[PDB]
């Protein structure tokens, strides 16, 4: 595989969004992956409605601001036959009744693909598919205060993940400890968090924070 990948340079990635104080990270991860695969198909990048997912994908297993899973969001888009644009169905950071309108649907999917639970498989997927939805253990103060560099949290769990994010690439940079590889990860906490809203998370360090444990993408 390549040593470095960044799908933002290829037009696959919308700006960083802000989920607010609603536990809807799974919806932002899912819209990010679907924005990438829709762009791969149509050559058009269109921001998608997380609120549509929060309000409407309960039947697939999601629980609004109380959490959810990207694969359940991809299943909703398939079952529902569409997903509204961000513009048409803007984000309100609280769960309400479903207001999906098919006339404003701008995306579709035909299911999803789950990646084997190995960083080598995640790397192949990021290199060939586009941005990938992943789950990580983000439950540490070090993740709140991240500014730059490669994020490594010795207490991070590889099995207990609590936050969905989007891997848009990977790369390397020289470091003191010579653990130099990272996943380039788009978060949904606004652009004031991290490096313009992104974090470089340790790569090939025993599946740090579980980044390869629940990785998937929608089939478009
Ligand atoms: C991220 O904002 C939220 C915060 C949840 C607490 C309010 N995290 C999730 O949604 C998390 C993401 C996965 C690890 C990818 N999932 C979650 O909390 O799921 C709970 C749940 C599981 C299955 C079905 C419904 C709810």
UniProtKB/Swiss-Prot annotation:
Prodomain positions:
176-178
**Could you say which residues bind Zn(2+) 7 here?**
162
Annotated positions binding Zn(2+) 4: 92, 96
- The UniProt annotation places Zn(2+) 2 binding at 50, 86
Give residues annotated as binding Zn(2+) 3.
Answer: 71, 114
**Annotated glycan sites:** 108
Active site annotation, chain numbering: 25, 163, 187
Which named protein is this? Cathepsin L
């Amino acid at each position: 595989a390549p040593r470095s990948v960044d799908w933002r340079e290829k037009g696959y990635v919308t700006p960083v969004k802000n989920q607010g104080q609603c536990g809807s990270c799974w919806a932002f991860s899912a819209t990010g992956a679907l924005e990438g695969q829709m762009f791969r198909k149509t050559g058009r990048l269109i921001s998608l409605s997380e609120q549509n997912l929060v309000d409407c994908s309960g039947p697939q297993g999601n629980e609004g601001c109380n959490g959810g899973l990207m694969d359940y969001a991809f299943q909703y888009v398939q079952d529902n036959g569409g997903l509204d644009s961000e513009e048409s169905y803007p984000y309100e950071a609280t769960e309400e009744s479903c207001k999906y309108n098919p006339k404003y649907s701008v995306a579709n999917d035909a299911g999803f693909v789950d990646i084997p639970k190995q960083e080598k498989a995640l790397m192949k997927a990021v290199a060939t598919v586009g941005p990938i939805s992943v789950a990580i253990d983000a439950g540490h103060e070090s993740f709140l205060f991240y500014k730059e560099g490669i994020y490594f949290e010795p207490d991070c769990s590889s099995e207990d993940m609590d936050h969905g994010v989007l891997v848009v690439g990977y790369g390397f940079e020289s470091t003191e400890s010579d653990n130099n590889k990272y996943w380039l990860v788009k978060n949904s906490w606004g652009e004031e968090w991290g490096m313009g809203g992104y974090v470089k998370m340790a790569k090939d360090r025993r599946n740090h924070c579980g980044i390869a444990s629940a990785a998937s993408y929608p089939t478009v």
